[PDB]
Amino acid sequence: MKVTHDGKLYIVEGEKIVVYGGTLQFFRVPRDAWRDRLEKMKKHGLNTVDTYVAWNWHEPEEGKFDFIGETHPQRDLIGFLELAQDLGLYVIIRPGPYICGEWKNGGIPEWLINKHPEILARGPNGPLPRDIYYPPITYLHPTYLGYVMKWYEQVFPIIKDYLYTKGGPIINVTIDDEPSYWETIFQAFLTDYNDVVVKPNGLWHKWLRETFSLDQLEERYKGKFSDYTEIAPPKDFSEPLPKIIDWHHFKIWMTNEYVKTLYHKIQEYVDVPVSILDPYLLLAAWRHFYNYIRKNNLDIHLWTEFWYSFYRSFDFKEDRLGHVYYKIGTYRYYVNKLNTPPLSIETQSSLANVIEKDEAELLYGLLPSLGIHNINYYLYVGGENPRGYESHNGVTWDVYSPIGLDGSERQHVEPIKWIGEFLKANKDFAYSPFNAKVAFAMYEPYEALNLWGHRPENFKESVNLNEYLFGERGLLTLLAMSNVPFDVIDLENTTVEEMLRYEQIWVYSLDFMGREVQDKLAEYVEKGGNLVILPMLPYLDENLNEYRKLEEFLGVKVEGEPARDNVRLIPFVSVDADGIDRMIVRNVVREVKGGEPIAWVEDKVVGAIVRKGKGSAVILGFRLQYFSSYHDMHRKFVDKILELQGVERDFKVTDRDMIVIPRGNYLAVINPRGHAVKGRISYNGIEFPKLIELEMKNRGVLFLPVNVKYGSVEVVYSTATVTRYEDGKITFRNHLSNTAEVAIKGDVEGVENGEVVEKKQEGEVTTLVIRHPGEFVLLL
Ligand SMILES: [Cl-]
């Protein structure tokens, strides 16, 4: 029968499942080894196998298709689908045409590029070099699209036959791969100057015509123009910044058009959910993706991925919390609006030299914590590249995969196993809320500036948002580490009504901010919102014309020298505040004039709070960042800002190094630090544990039940994660401490694999302290 969904979980024959998967690229693993690798995968508790189908592998020469391994054992797609169904695994199939994968041309046949070079995307002064990885292709070139349709016509009859709805194992089809214009969208002027794009009345002139009036282009580029065809694409940073942002948005539109063409062809063959991974390889630009699929009525499931370390030892510590909170807050914003299940189809399990289990646990544990409860680990099964098909790794496709090319099991399987068990045993976790009091509000054009690293010529503010916002010392890392879980909203898409769901919104500002955005933020405050804005107020609009509406509304001026980019000339400044002694900040600090002062550098006020209408705004003349110290003034200052604006955390911890992310009846409890944390949690009118403290000896993640029912018993609280429930047996796991506290409403028959060293009965509640080697069973 059917594959459907309820916006939290996929539903197969009307059964809710948690997709818990690994990637096994059949075409890079010996055929002799497939059954072995899939059985180990099942043994680790995976219910799904992901694989690409590579156009250039199954069509090695124009017209010569092989899906049965006539020609090479590993060309046997049919056989791989048959075995996956035989062992009772679901399949996610990603048939491209582009599959990335560190694979020659990202799946695009060499014969195609050699036959039709006219399809190749061009630089502004001529062709790109031909020996670069993933030779960039003009997506909308008719010859390219004609050849893709040829590929889809061959692989989609097979996919169709192995769909869950046709009796097969395939539950999802993914479009292309993180379509990014072949990873060229990171550079303003690398692509694409192909004739179809740039000829008079080409895609560029068409897009301008559809997006803008000439009267708008005149204000925006500050020229006169009597026709759209007079406007050449920008090729360098002498050109108006608005026109370069437009060029960026225009590449994203060609990508959207590409995807729509693929979706329409796929829809002729497929009646299961259709997905896409990380459009454009961007985050804030997902506003364009959302708008495009809404406008074009495309039922595409947005899925995401986590990559943190490339061709070095895996490095996943406290430093990453900003970026992960940001990326998953952004993802959570979009899948909540689209009402599709959150899924990470590529969770890093390879391409780092060594993946240490406590660092892997922190990443893997954070996905469900922040709302991604469907998980595929990439790459799960180590392989080897057939000769001719190498790109990024030469021979090897076993860079610390959970299962090696030799079939060994590596250390990061431990966290992969127990998280699966927990998600399977607690499907209610999938339906849990994320009740953020606080939002970070992102302004998408800033993403583009940060991406390119070009500081506009008279900008008073740095475009290094990796340093000041996203990275290891970023504002967002500070908020994470200050125990402020946050949502992410897009300032252009959000309505004031949506903004008013948040007790507090943080905005990072540069020189320019769109008029509609500057107005909504003022109205947010007017209507009872609490804005925090730094390290300046904008004084320009989206055309870079004077616009200071937010600054006139708040009645404050933020004056100071422009920020410096020469690392030697970046000043250090000590900021005092009530209860705060010389909090270090970096780069120039601005005088905040007006409001009630809350932060000063000696004589000078550098931070203030104002009340406007029903609400308040905190204006900081500096870049607040995550610095760690005994004195810990940065986290203390965040606390003061939330108290100033009356923002109330749903929870308290006695050790502020213990990160808690409340999820209704579950607490995601996180030690991100490489040291022990020990303390108690206050949540939902209770404080626990009461008899012992909650000890996390090292880095790791717990998911603790608070008032969760298991059959006729309720777990009032646990210092250990429930990994399994059978009739009368609950299994608890805590590898971070040898002492667990459990409070139970129900009849406790006993404990397997643990000794009860303490017991209290208060009315209906049995409380036990259990000493255990890392896992114990309660009998009820
Ligand atoms: Cl070979």
Domain 3-187+253-431 classification at class level: alpha beta
d(CA 429, CA 415): 18
d(CA 208, CA 503): 39
Alpha-carbon dihedral 744, 749, 753, 756, rounded to 10 degrees? 60
Measured in Å, residue 126 CA sits from the centre of ligand 1 at 36
Measured over the CA atoms of residue 152, residue 157, residue 161 and residue 164, the dihedral's sign is: positive
Q: Is-contact 366 334, C-beta < 8 A?
A: no
Q: Where are the beta strands (DSSP E) in 623-699?
A: 651-653, 659-663, 666-671, 677-679, 681-683, 686-688, 694-696
Q: Is-contact 704 717, C-beta < 8 A?
A: yes
Q: Are strands 572-577 and 557-559 parallel, antiparallel or unpaired?
A: unpaired
Q: Is-contact 170 177, C-beta < 8 A?
A: no
Paired tokens of 26: 């059949």
Listing DSSP states for 33-79 in one string gives GHHHHHHHHHHTT--EEEEE--HHHH-SBTTB--SS-SS-GGG-HHH
Domain ranges of the chain: 3-187+253-431, 438-644, 651-779
Paired tokens of 383: 């392989």
d(CA 185, CA 456): 19
Nearest to 367 by CA among 315, 439, 438, 316: 316
Measured in Å, residue 556 CA sits from the centre of ligand 1 at 68
Measured in Å, residue 630 CA sits from the centre of ligand 1 at 57
Domain 651-779 classification at class level: mainly beta
Q: Is-contact 263 155, C-beta < 8 A?
A: no
User: What percentage of the chain's residues is helix, strand, coil (to nearest 5)?
Assistant: 30, 30, 40
Paired tokens of 205: 């002139």
Task: Please return the burial class of 493, using the count of CB atoms within 10 Å of its CB with bins 0-12, 13-18 and 19+.
Answer: middle
Paired tokens of 409: 């099991």
Nearest to 59 by CA among 136, 156, 155, 175: 155
Q: Is-contact 659 681, C-beta < 8 A?
A: no
| Beta carbons within 10 angstroms of residue 732's beta carbon | 25
Please name the residue ranges forming H helices in 395-536: 413-425, 444-452, 465, 475-481, 496-499, 515-526
Listing DSSP states for 576-597 in one string gives EETTEEEEEEES---EEESSEE
DSSP code, position 129:
P
| Beta carbons within 10 angstroms of residue 446's beta carbon | 20
Q: Is-contact 718 740, C-beta < 8 A?
A: yes
Q: Is-contact 702 348, C-beta < 8 A?
A: no
Go through the chain and tell me how many residues it has.
780
Measured in Å, residue 396 CA sits from the centre of ligand 1 at 12
Alpha-carbon dihedral 146, 150, 152, 158, rounded to 10 degrees? 170
Task: Please return the burial class of 380, using the count of CB atoms within 10 Å of its CB with bins 0-12, 13-18 and 19+.
Answer: buried
d(CA 10, CA 589): 50
Question: Could you give phi then psi for residue 378, rounded to 5 degrees?
Answer: -130, 125
Q: Are strands 90-94 and 694-696 parallel, antiparallel or unpaired?
A: unpaired
- Tell me how many degrees the CA angle 391-393-398 measures, rounded to the nearest 5: 130
d(CA 378, CA 94): 13
CATH number, span 438-644: 3.40.50.880
Contacts 24+ apart (CB under 8 A), 34-43: 34/79, 34/80, 34/83, 35/83, 35/87, 36/407, 37/381, 37/403, 37/407, 38/83, 38/84, 38/87, 38/89, 39/87, 40/403, 40/407, 40/409, 41/89, 41/380, 41/381, 41/403, 42/87, 42/88, 42/89
Q: Is-contact 410 459, C-beta < 8 A?
A: no
Measured in Å, residue 71 CA sits from the centre of ligand 1 at 11
Q: Is-contact 208 253, C-beta < 8 A?
A: no
Reported as type and span, the H/E element at residue 706 is strand 700-710
In one letter, which amino acid is 241? Answer: L
d(CA 656, CA 482): 7
In one letter, which amino acid is 619? Answer: I
Strand, helix or coil at 657?
coil
Measured in Å, residue 395 CA sits from the centre of ligand 1 at 10
Burial annotation 455-487 (CB, 10 A radius, 16+ → b, else e): bbeebbbbbbbbbbbbbbbbbbbbbbbbbbbbb
Neighbouring residues of 373: CB distance < 8 A, sequence distance ≥ 6: 8, 18, 342, 367, 423, 429, 430
Reported as type and span, the H/E element at residue 716 is strand 713-718
Paired tokens of 543: 């055309």
d(CA 148, CA 56): 11
Nearest to 230 by CA among 204, 261, 250: 204
Nearest to 90 by CA among 8, 172, 176: 172
Q: Is-contact 98 182, C-beta < 8 A?
A: yes
Strand, helix or coil at 189?
coil
Q: Is-contact 181 121, C-beta < 8 A?
A: yes
| Beta carbons within 10 angstroms of residue 30's beta carbon | 14
d(CA 529, CA 513): 19
Q: Where are the beta strands (DSSP E) in 426-579?
A: 438-442, 486-490, 504-508, 530-534, 557-559, 572-577
Measured in Å, residue 168 CA sits from the centre of ligand 1 at 29
Q: Is-contact 159 166, C-beta < 8 A?
A: no
Alpha-carbon dihedral 278, 281, 282, 285, rounded to 10 degrees? -70
Method used to solve the structure: X-ray
Q: Is-contact 368 432, C-beta < 8 A?
A: no
Task: Please return the burial class of 66, using the count of CB atoms within 10 Å of its CB with bins 0-12, 13-18 and 19+.
Answer: middle
Reported as type and span, the H/E element at residue 92 is strand 90-94
Q: Is-contact 484 638, C-beta < 8 A?
A: yes
In one letter, which amino acid is 381? Answer: V
Whole-angstrom CA distances from 338 to 333, 435, 520, 599, 746 are: 9, 18, 23, 41, 41
Nearest to 463 by CA among 455, 471, 475: 455
Whole-angstrom CA distances from 717 to 106, 433, 631, 678, 759 are: 49, 18, 33, 17, 14
Measured in Å, residue 452 CA sits from the centre of ligand 1 at 40
Q: Is-contact 465 692, C-beta < 8 A?
A: no
Measured in Å, residue 381 CA sits from the centre of ligand 1 at 18
Paired tokens of 112: 């195609």
The structure was resolved to a resolution in Å of 2.1
Measured in Å, residue 403 CA sits from the centre of ligand 1 at 21
Paired tokens of 228: 């759209």
Please name the residue ranges forming H helices in 371-492: 413-425, 444-452, 465, 475-481
d(CA 666, CA 662): 6
Measured in Å, residue 104 CA sits from the centre of ligand 1 at 14
Measured in Å, residue 386 CA sits from the centre of ligand 1 at 4
Neighbouring residues of 164: CB distance < 8 A, sequence distance ≥ 6: 2, 3, 12, 90, 170, 171, 272
Find the radius of gyration of the CA atoms of the chain: 27
Task: Please return the burial class of 155, using the count of CB atoms within 10 Å of its CB with bins 0-12, 13-18 and 19+.
Answer: buried
Nearest to 421 by CA among 713, 662, 715, 722: 722
Nearest to 587 by CA among 575, 602, 605, 600: 575
Q: How far is CA 406 from the centre of its chain?
A: 32
Measured in Å, residue 72 CA sits from the centre of ligand 1 at 8
Neighbouring residues of 473: CB distance < 8 A, sequence distance ≥ 6: 467, 625, 626, 627
Measured in Å, residue 74 CA sits from the centre of ligand 1 at 9
Catalytic residues: 178, 346
d(CA 505, CA 530): 6
Which residues have a C–N gap over 2.5 Å right after them in the chain?
none
